[PDB]
Design a binder for these strands. Sequence first.
DNA 1: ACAGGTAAGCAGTCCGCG
DNA 2: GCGGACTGCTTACC
Length: 901
Amino acid sequence: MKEFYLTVEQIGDSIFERYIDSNGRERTREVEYKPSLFAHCPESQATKYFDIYGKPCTRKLFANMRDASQWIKRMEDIGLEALGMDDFKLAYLSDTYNYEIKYDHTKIRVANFDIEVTSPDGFPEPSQAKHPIDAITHYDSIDDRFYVFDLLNSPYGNVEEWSIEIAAKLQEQGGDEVPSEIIDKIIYMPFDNEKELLMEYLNFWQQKTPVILTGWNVESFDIPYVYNRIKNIFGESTAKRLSPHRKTRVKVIENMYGSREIITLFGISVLDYIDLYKKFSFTNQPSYSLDYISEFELNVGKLKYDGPISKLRESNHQRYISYNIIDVYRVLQIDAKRQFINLSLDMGYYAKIQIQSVFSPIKTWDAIIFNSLKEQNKVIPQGRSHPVQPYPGAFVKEPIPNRYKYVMSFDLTSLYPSIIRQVNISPETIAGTFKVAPLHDYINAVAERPSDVYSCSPNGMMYYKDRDGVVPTEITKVFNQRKEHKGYMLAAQRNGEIIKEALHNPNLSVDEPLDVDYRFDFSDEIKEKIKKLSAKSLNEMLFRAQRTEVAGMTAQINRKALINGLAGALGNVWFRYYDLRNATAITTFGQMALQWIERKVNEYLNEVCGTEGEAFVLYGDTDSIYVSADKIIDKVGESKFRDTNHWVDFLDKFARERMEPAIDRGFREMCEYMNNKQHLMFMDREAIAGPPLGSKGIGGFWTGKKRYALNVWDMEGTRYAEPKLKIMGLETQKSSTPKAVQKALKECIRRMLQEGEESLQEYFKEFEKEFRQLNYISIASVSSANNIAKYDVGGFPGPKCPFHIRGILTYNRAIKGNIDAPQVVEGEKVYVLPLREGNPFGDKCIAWPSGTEITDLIKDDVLHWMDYTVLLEKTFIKPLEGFTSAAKLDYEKKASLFDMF
DNA sequence: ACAGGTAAGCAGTCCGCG
DNA sequence: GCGGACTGCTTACC
Ligand SMILES: Cc1cn([C@H]2C[C@H](O)[C@@H](COP(=O)(O)OP(=O)(O)OP(=O)(O)O)O2)c(=O)[nH]c1=O
Ligand SMILES: [Ca+2]
Ligand SMILES: [Ca+2]
Ligand SMILES: [Ca+2]
Ligand SMILES: [Ca+2]
Ligand SMILES: [Cl-]
């Protein structure tokens, strides 16, 4: 089989690499790598190395890696460009793997792990590691085994072995309910003492050394804690065994509130799942406890126990171990759904970087572009330094706040990358400039055609049409992968809607779910086979379909993220190819494109309706238009259609047959006008939106930019079983609005768009009446805890102190003394509650770490002195007023004037 | 340091206001 | 005694 790397590191003048050989065997080697850089030389001097502009370079081989760096320095000490890949790991990878890497994941050792530390001192600090490690569950992807290391004796109690027979049993039967499918995969190891526990774990680490190291919060807690515990006990030399090469960097970086520490383990690629999740999940969560994320992701419960966690090992060691095992499995369950490790392997190898570098779009693209260039014997430029300059981005239309009954939207496919490809924007495709008319002259086709020779952006830049450019070339590739997985995604979604429809005719029948690939539109026979199936079998299929979709979502949205990131990278001063000329060429062309088609789309319909100079496009952001479809519908009359589904099927056909071809012609012209390389501005219909037929519903509304709600029947060719609410920017979407309140505002909106005003009033009446009975956690606000210190000033609110920061201050003050209550972690999320007039906290609000319940030390005073009125007013009524005003409705019954009857 | 800009709403502070 | 203008902060939308 083809060879592939596991990990690479540079230590002094040597490169350390773990890899899989041509026989599937894991090997390590240290290489005295001889790097090669480049300097400009005279035109006459004939070589085969040219920089990106076509200027000739000379290659310089260095005896060791230090020599190469010293030269770079000496060249800056002179003032001449020092060219080539300065990060030697990437050049080594590029040299050692001159082909497209096809890896075998079953050969890659991914370790998933978690530890427990009993601590009656408050949170056990990794930097200090004062308390014993008393459990380690470590899953190995190669062995398919959960390795459990369990301490029975410690300063904080002595405990009987864990029982796997009990662990397996129901909660409802006094067991722990550890899943069947992993019961047989547990390797249990009791330990007399911590010394042996740790000593054994290290020898285990040696024989099954992780390549990919993951888990929950593993980089802020488990890794640092185990490193430091071993360091405190056996010395830093032993602790260094956690690195296959024995080298570790310790980034001290503290804060005002003590000492936090991050350890780098050379030879291992650490991918903390919380960071994977934050980067790839595209959620903004109110809390990042595993319980919370497990629940959100897998719809599994809370992992319940009695008393605090600090007292769990002693009171119930049985459950203490099972819960540690389950925590590890949970991350695995999340990864089987989200596929983030898989994604990271794909990108890492695609680009030829350290896998952990996937967190860096700049590092990722530098390498892709580097390798691409290396293939044509071209030489990359030196990374220079620049001042940060702001630059303009997208255009957003200011909309008329209002209800809108029938709405149809249209969106451009991968716009910024498409613009890159259409215009041919790349560091070496720059041809010159032209003098720019103000933007609106390009929008309305008044300004003279900028060039007859080059491809142009309304920002005044001109690019060669004939050549290629690495950026377009490399961007097009990742785009095509994007399009592939999007395709799989949408079809899985389409299929999922068909299963939903079928769940109205569930057959009284005993069968198994169909063996089908959900990435592809179901065939007629499969469809025919589906109606006759049972509920039990249909639901299994639905679940699978969704699972396919999530998988496809992950692959698609994150390639999109990466390609959009190149476009922004052009405007990050650390990117090798930083260049505001190019970044600005992207954004400005975007602004023109959007407004150009707004002109065209208003023009077309005004002709097609005979009407004169009416507005149809009511909104647009960046690359989207929202078209007011009322006149098209009225041209036929709501009298007809019989059902909702008729007029949707109408509008759809009108979009695909009439609008798009006009839209296409519009973008053809603009491409011509701009004289671009290839037309790639593709705008197809997205959402079809309105109320159920002849209902009291308003269909949709806007409040301003970035804030609207629509009742969507069809989205990108997916016809929903039930109409789905598209809500953008409103409080229902924000992680800072109380859960109960999101839910209720969503129903108010649902009731606004699907049913009428009465329905909405009826609900508002109910909600307010019932509000005081909801759980405190459900009605609490959420916020991040940035810059606590800055505003601290004696433990009381400093100047211009933010509302939430104030609330933490009241917390801290109220938990003074008993270091036992959890401390608000700086930069983490908190619940916030307003405090009622004249309370014992001596301030007007309180905050505490999210996920958690507040410690009982203050819980009951918080519940009593709770300010429901200010909560209701601020978080619910206020935003509702916003929605209904814009919608021209009232949430409360108005004074009839007739009431005197 | 190690993708980008655009933009909304909520509070705090300071000022004008018979 | 409070509303408006401005700014800090937070979290959305592309
Ligand atoms: C979502 C997003 C968009 N954008 C910019 C670049 C996008 O080309 C443009 C429009 O964004 P989107 O409409 O969200 O998506 P897209 O055009 O990139 O791709 P698609 O429509 O197929 O999903 O806005 C970013 O710069 N960063 C981002 O994270
Ligand atoms: Ca734990
Ligand atoms: Ca689309
Ligand atoms: Ca788009
Ligand atoms: Ca869009
Ligand atoms: Cl230590």
